[PDB]
Amino acid sequence: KETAAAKFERQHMDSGNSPSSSSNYCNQMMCCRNLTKDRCKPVNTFVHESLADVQAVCSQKNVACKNGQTNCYQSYSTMSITDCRETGSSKYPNCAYKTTQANKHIIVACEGNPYVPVHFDASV
Amino acid sequence: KETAAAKFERQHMDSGNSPSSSSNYCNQMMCCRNLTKDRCKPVNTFVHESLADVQAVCSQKNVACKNGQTNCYQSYSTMSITDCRETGSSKYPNCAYKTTQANKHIIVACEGNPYVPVHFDASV
Q: What is the 3-state secondary structure (H, E, C) of chain A?
A: CCCHHHHHHHHHECCCCCCCCCCCHHHHHHHHCCCCCCCCCCEEEEECCCHHHHHHHHHCEEECCCCCCCCEEECCCCEEEEEEEECCCCECCECCEEEEEEEECEEEEEECCCCEEEEEEEEC
Amino acid at site A55: Q
Asked if the bond preceding B93 is cis, omega within 30° of 0, the reply is yes
The interface residues of chain B toward chain A in range 10-39, judged by CB-CB distance below 8 A, are 10-22, 25, 29, 33-35
Report the C-alpha gap between A70 and B109 in whole angstroms.
58
PDB resolution in Å: 2.0
Q: Which amino acids of A are annotated catalytic?
A: 12, 119
CA dihedral B33, B38, B43, B49 (to 10 degrees): -10
Q: How far is CA B38 from CA A5, B22, B35, B48, B87, in A?
A: 21, 24, 8, 26, 17
Provide the residue count of chain B. 124
Architecture of domain B1-124: Roll (3.10)
Report the C-alpha gap between B50 and B76 in whole angstroms.
15
How was this structure determined? It was done by: X-ray
Nearest neighbour of A19 by CB, restricted to B5, B45, B101: B101
Do residue B119 and residue A45 have CB atoms under 8 angstroms apart?
no
Query: Strand A106-111 relative to strand A72-74: parallel, antiparallel, unpaired?
Result: antiparallel
Do residue B14 and residue A82 have CB atoms under 8 angstroms apart?
yes
Collapsing DSSP to helix, strand or coil, B30 comes out as helix
Max distance between CA atoms of chain A, in angstroms, equals 71
E-strand ranges in chain B read 43-47, 61-63, 72-74, 79-86, 97-104, 106-111, 116-123
Query: Torsions phi, psi of A78, nearest 5?
Result: -80, 150
Query: Torsions phi, psi of B81, nearest 5?
Result: -140, 165
Within 8 A of A18 by CB-CB distance, chain B residues are 48, 80, 82, 101
Helices then strands (H, E): number in chain B? 3, 7
Provide the residue count of chain A. 124
Whether the Cβ atoms of residue A114 and residue A55 lie closer than 8 Å to each other: yes
Collapsing DSSP to helix, strand or coil, B26 comes out as helix
Whether the Cβ atoms of residue A72 and residue A107 lie closer than 8 Å to each other: yes
Report the C-alpha gap between A69 and B81 in whole angstroms.
42
Among chain B residues, the shortest Cα distance to A50 is held by: B15
The CB density around residue B35, as the number of other CB atoms within 10 Å, is: 20
Whether the Cβ atoms of residue A85 and residue A97 lie closer than 8 Å to each other: yes
Query: Strand A116-123 relative to strand B106-111: parallel, antiparallel, unpaired?
Result: unpaired
Collapsing DSSP to helix, strand or coil, B55 comes out as helix
Collapsing DSSP to helix, strand or coil, B88 comes out as coil
Q: How far is CA B29 from CA A101, A112, B25, in A?
A: 20, 48, 6
Give the H/E segment covering residue B92: none
Collapsing DSSP to helix, strand or coil, B34 comes out as coil
Nearest neighbour of A15 by CB, restricted to B12, B18, B50: B50
* Domain range summary for chain B, segments of one domain joined by +: 1-124
Report the C-alpha gap between B93 and B54 in whole angstroms.
31
